[PDB]
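Help! Submission page says 'invalid entity' but I think these are all valid:
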Amino acid sequence: AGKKVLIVYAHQEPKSFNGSLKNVAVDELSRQGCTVTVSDLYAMNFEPRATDKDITGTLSNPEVFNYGVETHEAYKQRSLASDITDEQKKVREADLVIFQFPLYWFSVPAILKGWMDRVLCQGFAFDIPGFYDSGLLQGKLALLSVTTGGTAEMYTKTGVNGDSRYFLWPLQHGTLHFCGFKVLAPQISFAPEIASEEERKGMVAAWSQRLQTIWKEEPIPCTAHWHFGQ
Amino acid sequence: AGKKVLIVYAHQEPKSFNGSLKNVAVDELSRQGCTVTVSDLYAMNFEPRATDKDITGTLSNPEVFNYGVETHEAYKQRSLASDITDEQKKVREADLVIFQFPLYWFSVPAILKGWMDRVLCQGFAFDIPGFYDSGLLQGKLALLSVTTGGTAEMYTKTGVNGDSRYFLWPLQHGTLHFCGFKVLAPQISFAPEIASEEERKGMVAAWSQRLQTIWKEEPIPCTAHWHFGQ
Ligand SMILES: Cc1cc2nc3c(=O)[nH]c(=O)nc-3n(C[C@H](O)[C@H](O)[C@H](O)COP(=O)(O)OP(=O)(O)OC[C@H]3O[C@@H](n4cnc5c(N)ncnc54)[C@H](O)[C@@H]3O)c2cc1C
Ligand SMILES: Cc1cc2nc3c(=O)[nH]c(=O)nc-3n(C[C@H](O)[C@H](O)[C@H](O)COP(=O)(O)OP(=O)(O)OC[C@H]3O[C@@H](n4cnc5c(N)ncnc54)[C@H](O)[C@@H]3O)c2cc1C
Ligand SMILES: CCN(CC)CCC[C@H](C)Nc1ccnc2cc(Cl)ccc12
Ligand SMILES: CCN(CC)CCC[C@H](C)Nc1ccnc2cc(Cl)ccc12
Ligand SMILES: [Zn+2]
Ligand SMILES: [Zn+2]
């Protein structure tokens, strides 16, 4: 026991469907006795841009700015902007990181993309070498809880939008697995705007109910076959 | 001729490999007699976050904030923030939109993700019923010019990262095709940091040379089969 959870939450509106899914996760994980922290990115005005302001120390090469190189070195020297290290502390302490967001352009909203870009730097989240199964966040779990405009039917193989797993690839594999996370099955709450209020309440209750047994779940095999099939 | 091009450019450093690819595109398209415009997102300090500041008027619903609905209505009511409408004007005038960026987490840097989120609103880029082949930007061409850290071999179907086409799906299909663009084959400049000077020169020259005949190209079939098939 004694599990720690970080929820990285990306919605502007506390009364939103995303807000309800975040709150029910806080409620249920709290009820279980888990330690819970939420990064409410919009409320934090979280900075999404990868810039030279993210390093406060002497640059390795002040004539030609290479974000990856400079953040790697800043991580090692401890000269990263404090907003980044504040998030790194939350990740370091977490056993499970839940990302709660509406799908924007088959991906995460930009503010959350910026969290990934800025927080998961070399030295902290991965090394070269030291990625995928050797990533530095090994031993941790991650889970994408996503809401969509499109219906489940629209996000199937035979639909023009394609199977929902297709768009998970850059997030689950390219990012989370790359950093060493084991990835729990995504929670996709399809088309709440189209849904009836009863169907919406059902989707929120389904997430809460799933969370009751989250610590017993196995991760997915985060492979091309899982995402794309044969 | 009389062709118009917008380059949406996302790199912090003018002397970067991305910078050089952007500059060669400007040079070669300018030489051809094309009309060329560049949105240098980092130099513009482009806002990535989707917030209620993106609507200038009174909100469609001041009590509960729905970004998609509010921006749709704002577009119809000419009440979007000027940074967004400035970009929409550039897109509206363009026959070809080139995106020039380094791959960040199998996707675009957050600043460019924010451009997509905030600029391509419903009513402007898509609507009911105009999407995929009938998207509102139909008749326009789009092209992703991406640079990577990983090698071409890492980006193979059975390589650690999977086929590069796998990460293109959310961008080419879920975003560009969705908005009605015809998608020209991506330009992928693999691993310039690792490449020799000569190899880098070759990749820049390949891009310059490609641009010489860009108006003669057929778009790819932006399908699941192209992205995921044998
Ligand atoms: C920039 C942008 C890009 C997008 N790109 C995509 C894309 O690529 N693919 C795609 O499929 N969609 C896309 N969308 C649509 C988007 O994913 C949906 O709009 C979003 O997922 C809806 O979630 P929400 O929390 O905002 O819904 P909400 O509008 O907040 O929720 C709907 C309703 O649920 C109600 N509600 C809240 N809590 C509860 C509760 N506890 N019980 C019952 N009802 C409740 C709310 O009052 C509301 O009426 C995009 C949208 C934007 C703005
Ligand atoms: C947050 C983050 C996430 C990332 N995620 C990924 C990922 O998911 N997958 C992946 O594969 N990579 C990833 N990367 C790596 C990234 O994609 C590469 O670092 C980037 O593409 C390199 O391009 P660049 O323009 O910055 O190269 P640069 O470092 O600017 O350039 C490389 C070399 O080319 C030289 N050069 C510039 N112009 C010319 C010229 N005209 N002729 C010859 N040489 C020239 C430069 O001087 C330099 O020496 C990530 C990086 C970051 C920071
Ligand atoms: C017209 C607005 N309103 C009236 C019913 C319906 C809500 C709008 C719906 C949910 N939004 C969407 C539904 C489905 N797909 C989408 C893809 C993108 Cl990129 C953006 C928005 C999307
Ligand atoms: C000083 C040496 N310097 C090159 C300038 C280090 C370059 C490291 C290499 C290129 N970067 C990378 C190579 C391959 N994959 C990657 C995935 C991510 Cl997320 C981030 C960086 C990556
Ligand atoms: Zn994986
Ligand atoms: Zn397509």
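Support: the input was valid. A stray whitespace character was the problem, and the output above is from the cleaned input. Residues A 66, 68-69, 128, 178; B 105, 149-150, 193-194 surround 0TX (ligand 4) (CB under 6 Å).
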